[PDB]
Amino acid sequence: LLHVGPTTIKEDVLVAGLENNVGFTSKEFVEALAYSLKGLRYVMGASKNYQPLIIPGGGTSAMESVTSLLKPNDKILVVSNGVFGDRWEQIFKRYPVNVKVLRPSPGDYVKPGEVEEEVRKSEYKLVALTHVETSTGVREPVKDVINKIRKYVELIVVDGVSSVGAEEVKAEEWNVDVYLTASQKALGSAAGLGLLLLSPKALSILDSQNSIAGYYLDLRNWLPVMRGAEEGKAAYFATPPVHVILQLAEAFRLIEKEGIENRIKRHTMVASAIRAGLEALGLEIVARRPESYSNTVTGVILKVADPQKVLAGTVNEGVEFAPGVHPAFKYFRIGHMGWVTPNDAIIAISVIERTLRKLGEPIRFGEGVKAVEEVLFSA
Amino acid sequence: LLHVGPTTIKEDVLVAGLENNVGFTSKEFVEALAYSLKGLRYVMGASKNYQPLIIPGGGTSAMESVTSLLKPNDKILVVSNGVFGDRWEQIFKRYPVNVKVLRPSPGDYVKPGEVEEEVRKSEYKLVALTHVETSTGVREPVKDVINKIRKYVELIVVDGVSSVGAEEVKAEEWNVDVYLTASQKALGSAAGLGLLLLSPKALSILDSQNSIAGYYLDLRNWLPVMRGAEEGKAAYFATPPVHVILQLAEAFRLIEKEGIENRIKRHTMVASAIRAGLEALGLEIVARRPESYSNTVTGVILKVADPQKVLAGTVNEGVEFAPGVHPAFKYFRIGHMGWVTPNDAIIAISVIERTLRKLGEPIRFGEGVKAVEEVLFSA
Amino acid sequence: LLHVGPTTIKEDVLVAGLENNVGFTSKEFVEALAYSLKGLRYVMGASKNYQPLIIPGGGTSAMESVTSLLKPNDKILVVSNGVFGDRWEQIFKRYPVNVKVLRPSPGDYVKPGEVEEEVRKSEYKLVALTHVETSTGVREPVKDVINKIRKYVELIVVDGVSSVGAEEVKAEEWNVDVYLTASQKALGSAAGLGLLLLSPKALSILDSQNSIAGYYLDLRNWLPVMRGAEEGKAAYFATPPVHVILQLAEAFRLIEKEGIENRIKRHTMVASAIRAGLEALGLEIVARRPESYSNTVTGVILKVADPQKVLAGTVNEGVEFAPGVHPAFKYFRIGHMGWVTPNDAIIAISVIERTLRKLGEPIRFGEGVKAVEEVLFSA
Amino acid sequence: LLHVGPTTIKEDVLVAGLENNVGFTSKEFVEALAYSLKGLRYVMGASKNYQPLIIPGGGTSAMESVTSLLKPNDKILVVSNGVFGDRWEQIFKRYPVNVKVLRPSPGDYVKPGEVEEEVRKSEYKLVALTHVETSTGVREPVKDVINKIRKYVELIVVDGVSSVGAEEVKAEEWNVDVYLTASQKALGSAAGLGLLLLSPKALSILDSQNSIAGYYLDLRNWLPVMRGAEEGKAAYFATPPVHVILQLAEAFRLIEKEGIENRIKRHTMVASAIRAGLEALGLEIVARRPESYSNTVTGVILKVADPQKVLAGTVNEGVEFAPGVHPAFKYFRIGHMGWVTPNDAIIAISVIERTLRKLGEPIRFGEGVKAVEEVLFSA
């Protein structure tokens, strides 16, 4: 069997979807969409000059919709740290475009200098980055990368599926052209939506040029719906996931009530506490470089125990554990994103200690939970 | 302003989505997906030889995913009775294919003989039909069309967004290659999913040939998820709308409990009652030919009153009314599909009588409600 | 079998109860209780000098809690128009008190003069009235009764279970000492609570005297909880139905948003429309005197059809029908209270027409629904 | 301020109450009541000869309803270990009965021999016990008490509000005449109901004798409702909390799915783990005698820190902490009952360690969490 840990959704978020006479023209729907659109500007750090869109699907449909900005034979550079970086390449194989991929050593990340070198050597229409690579837990220093490449490339896109709402994101200040995410990860809402924030530059391409996009994923077709909503008007392109968007509006209400800076600090603390627990047990982290330890995903190397058995025996344990699928390592991953609290840190390390002791993975029993406690106490 | 009436969702359906620890690998999700896949075979009248898929989006994403069955320069005949027939052509303009469209007089439908004539004259890879054309309330005699064209064309696709779960559908008996619908219409569940049933012939194309499809809407990419689910296995292509699918499973449970034959009879009675009400008021129906009066949508011609004012004054009135957007007629539309009951028939005609009397549309006040009562009594 | 029609609850009301970490000391609970307490002053027409209480149970526990105001051998006059008036007497048999009951002819009501005559003849500590007698649909002219008896009696209590939130109620202006109701009737919330509004006179009895009350239903024990809540403080006597009270707060929000005067007008219109439908069918109303036709309950006399069969064949019909249990009449009752709309009037009469036609009760088929339409149109 | 920790309710339990067209005559309600009645026999260990009742209110209304079994001047012995034992005496002061109370030293419990001595010296109609005394966390050895007193007393009643569903209960085997609980404690459902299980002997009293009971709390009045439900019949005495009972049925489904023996073991393990944590910190438990350490409540003595500050700083910390209200001790209490898991044990001790360290209560920081881990590993 396959077992990937699901991001826990606050009941308030889910319950916001229980309105049984709401459609895409309902004032309640239009208001939730307009609210979510502003919520997206807020979590991504951008002013009204940046255009938000919320489309059906997820991170993957959002990624593919970037073809809305491309023309035949356009040159694309993908900076891929693993599975989800590689998905850009799989998507672009379906399109008449030219793709080059940079990859680092397993579990590492592509340095800003290496990207800079490549964009000076060849002219690229588009550069794709992955803010956090979910398969390895590695955060790319996207700000540093962009500072170096901004003047050599027409467009920069960042996959923030595992970062937005949890890691610092400054789409406008960093001059990103498309920052995208999904509803079900670090935002902690129900699945079904892709979310995008476009620069004025990307928006001009939409408004004035043709593209290689299909029909459903051409952001041009969704623009009138998004623009209409902010003016309090209903418009129809294709039926969106109405109740999932009601749920998203409620997630954004909770996000705005906590405050994004506070949200980020919470993810830093929880992740730091979890990592301190892992280290005190003598467990090795998958991410090669400490400065890249993402605050949403941590890969945990096992020397003796079978990762698959760790996952099988922790299914009903109130944790978010998932398989490690990189040939270079034997590991499982801990998801720690969304509504995650200090108690989730304690639980994750406790569940880990007890499971690994049972399976004979050499660990310093007791030391993990104590180290977690220490971190949580000290801040 | 734009106001389209929303299909009322049974609360039980919505409430089935309130499970806050479910992801695409959860056995609860896998079971709901497998159940919904079987439910789709059931409402469409097909055996295990036909392959169901449930994908993110809606009717439009389902329609576009038909490109999964096409090759460059393939010849397509679209039989379009209005807006949603025309959407096939709009979708196919994004693809390297050759499209011819047959259209009838406004509010009429393309006769089976006219389609037969065209497919004998020229060779077509694909013929696209719309079972019920939502913009006009016209039901295409799809069975009759197919009987005549089956031996002259490789593939037949039917858009059943406004028919499946309400009109008779026999995908297997009629030998349709793709029968498709959405979650939010005559099935009466929450929005966010497209649904497809493929013949063995269409499935062989998927399994053995390349196509002009993009990435997200290539049915090949969803097949392992659908096949896995029916064997009780989780598989990942892209995150689906997990909770919308939980809701869909519950809608299919209610559909199977009523029985599809009974469901169809209910839609026939409610629609017949509503139409009898309209006629007794002296109101003219948009559909030109009575044999094509769909049992999910009825267009109502106004001679004096402004359709927009009818819609504005019936917003909180517990009905499903929508604008008429065909230049050839001045009208509004009544949606009567999903969980619709005899009481909905009475309400719709009563709300119509009272609104039109207020606005001076010449009608036989009182006679509508009486005629509805008569029909509901006699069945 | 027994079949009593349930008051339909807005989903928003129910959904307000889905908070899974709320207890009697939670700020959310205290706020909902304080809100509901004010909501009770509002629907009953009283200033802050009147003391609201919300206790576990229903109308019956509220009625019994009136013993909190009594002493051994106190004299009580019950003005009983049927079953629920008679319940006062059944309750008081359990207590060392002296009870006299006035009853009118079946389906009539006790005139104000008849009560006045009795309270001048003997001295009574307490007079009990029923605002609307649910078993017959008869509204007592409580204002007129009180105007006549106020100076001759120490305490006046009014059972408003079937009136509060639907009929005009002015507890303060009319000088009532206890006005009581339940959560599940004309207020349209979930069952589980009795609700009481006490005059300063009744409150002084609580604060300064002993009583014959038991433990759970001694309003003295609940007072500190109610007083605490309005000061934003939690207090414990016995655990209340926490989530039912969350639901009640939401019902009061909806009531206050509509406005009580508007609520009353809606009940008048719906009831008048239903009665006009009944009359046009040639059906006789149970209430003997038109000025007493309650706007929450209407008894419908059948000359031929069996009331029990009317009820059996209308169970899934979206109506609120209940048995007639008074030996003097052959009838069923229509409940029309709470969130009831003009559409409910149309439905009730339509369901009645179709059911009675099937069962051979002589009626003027078609005429009922037309008369309802006319009433709803004319206001 | 007063802050008592709320028992966390599984969302599934709450969500079972979202049926908006259900009343006391609905077959859905009757089925939920019948199911809950059987569920009550199951959790209390009794065959069909024992009669369950579910009444509005809570533990307190259930306790008072025991007056249904009493006659004027009946002699009662209350075995009270604290607040909730003392509530028997407070209730009985409202009734013409003779009460004697046995009390132990603070935080201790009345030995079976001490009760035996008293019932042999004087003749008692009724002996009242508290299975777990919530105010001190002390479990009375009710089986041992009953074995000694059974032949000397007519009736034995046990308050199991904090024991039923968590501690071993054998109502039939131990020959208890009334075993009672509430919906919101160790059963973990929504508040609003009292629950009783009566012996054949107590039932004969109901069926054949008069009593000193009031009206609402006379178990005679509820019996036809309970008997009717198990024969699949609706009956009316007073409106029950319909949706709270739907929720209760769902709680009983979850209890029966786990199995009562397993439920008991879970409470033993979680409580043992929590206590091991407390001891390893050097914290003293309020219960004087280890054999009486209840598995639902533990009192924690503080030597230096203010209990009130512990409560104030742990409000949003996902725990169930409550004040200690016995003058003889300075303490707070930990609730660990219902759906409580091993993770709740870890969290409670961690939250305690971190809070007390902050407030300078002398503890062995780190040692609590380790001891909890050890216990959870070894079971």
Ligand SMILES: Cc1ncc(COP(=O)(O)O)c(CNc2cccc(C(=O)O)c2)c1O
């Ligand atoms: C960085 C990143 N980019 C793109 C996607 C694709 O999103 P959708 O699935 O919404 O199309 C993701 C999604 N991440 C994802 C999805 C499913 C499983 C796991 C796992 O942890 O094993 C991770 C992701 O984490």
Ligand SMILES: Cc1ncc(COP(=O)(O)O)c(CNc2cccc(C(=O)O)c2)c1O
């Ligand atoms: C026959 C038909 N085909 C395709 C679609 C597209 O479905 P999605 O929107 O789920 O992609 C539809 C949708 N039907 C539809 C959708 C929105 C509004 C109205 C209206 O009545 O104006 C009708 C439809 O009715």
Ligand SMILES: Cc1ncc(COP(=O)(O)O)c(CNc2cccc(C(=O)O)c2)c1O
């Ligand atoms: C006027 C009146 N007074 C007291 C009560 C008792 O309330 P509780 O049940 O909440 O204790 C009521 C309740 N009314 C009631 C209850 C059950 C059935 C029916 C029916 O219409 O057949 C009516 C009532 O309508």
Ligand SMILES: Cc1ncc(COP(=O)(O)O)c(CNc2cccc(C(=O)O)c2)c1O
């Ligand atoms: C043993 C026991 N007996 C009777 C009751 C009364 O139950 P109701 O409240 O449902 O009538 C209880 C209630 N237990 C209870 C209730 C409220 C607060 C606290 C606290 O921890 O301070 C404890 C109890 O714990």
Ligand SMILES: [Ca+2]
């Ligand atoms: Ca909440």
Ligand SMILES: [Ca+2]
């Ligand atoms: Ca239901």
Ligand SMILES: [Ca+2]
């Ligand atoms: Ca035919």
Ligand SMILES: [Ca+2]
């Ligand atoms: Ca015409």
Ligand SMILES: [Ca+2]
């Ligand atoms: Ca709402």
Ligand SMILES: [Ca+2]
């Ligand atoms: Ca569940």
Ligand SMILES: [Ca+2]
């Ligand atoms: Ca023993």
Ligand SMILES: [Ca+2]
């Ligand atoms: Ca001590």
